[PDB]
Amino acid sequence: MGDTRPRFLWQLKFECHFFNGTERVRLLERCIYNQEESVRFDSDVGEYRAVTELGRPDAEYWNSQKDLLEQRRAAVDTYCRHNYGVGESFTVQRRVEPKVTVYPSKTQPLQHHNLLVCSVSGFYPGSIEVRWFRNGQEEKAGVVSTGLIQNGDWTFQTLVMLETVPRSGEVYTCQVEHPSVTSPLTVEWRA
Amino acid sequence: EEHVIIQAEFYLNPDQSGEFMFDFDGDEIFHVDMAKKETVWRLEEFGRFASFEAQGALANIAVDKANLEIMTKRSNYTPITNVPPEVTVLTNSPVELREPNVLICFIDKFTPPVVNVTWLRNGKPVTTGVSETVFLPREDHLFRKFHYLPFLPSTEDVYDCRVEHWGLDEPLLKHWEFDA
């Protein structure tokens, strides 16, 4: 953009943390001017706290309104636990099974296939376990991954690669474990 | 530990841009569009199991504007330092010839949230089918964005995500092409 007037940003974030369902809940109110967080409410404390000098004024001010502190201490119940109950059926409980493919590839462009890709996509939630096997024996060495990748449409994907010399007669198995299935997904590729 | 729900709003001057959204574990449940004053759901199904009165959002952007003005004055007009984005371009899944798929453009770790983003097919900008997210939050207080472009993949077609941002001296391009 042909536009170089300075910018000024204010953000406000209320984060609810849940642990072990609804059994433990910690709320955080932060506000942030231009990349620096100035002041914070933590439900573990029950008061506002300045994070920088710039926000000591606003802590003192908010900390003097007892109707406000009382609301915020209760929010763990009326807000957090509220939204958790409302959202649970379709966020906490959401489950989408991965599509799994195997296909061979090359670490260098015009060399020999020396790289098996295990593609795991369209899954939710994000906790996965992906493991390679040669002839029913797990291969721990020569494995790289893209990491877990979030598509931004409530699905995740990952590529998990095994750098190998494919010797003919060998059976490779990519094995995936995921909350959406009760026993391991497996796809085989014959060298 | 296990799950995180975030309510994130911002206000940015002098563009006068507001945003308000809810985020479950990094994924967005909904945002409110300032222009139409209505709740946009990230998935249509969410509209069927939940509701949100969008007037609460409007009311909070009003307060955040008033707040930003105060904070601006008090900092003696110290402005945000531009942080340029990382960009990657990925597929929805492994691509086969003639099988519809979706190119994703991930824009990440940037501030403030103004960002111009174009998709290019063989150099030429592409409008049909594109769609995108609003800016999502980050623990470090920078932003993330996604752009999307469904496409029918082929040998003789190349694409790029082209991103411009104030913290970048040049437009940043990320290429993708069918490899087999």
Partner: peptide, 14 residues
């Protein structure tokens, strides 16, 4: 499975 609640933003001291 219900209506979602927004928490309310608080003006700073002018």
């Amino acid at each position: 499975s219900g209506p979602l609640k927004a928490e309310i933003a608080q003006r700073l001291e002018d």
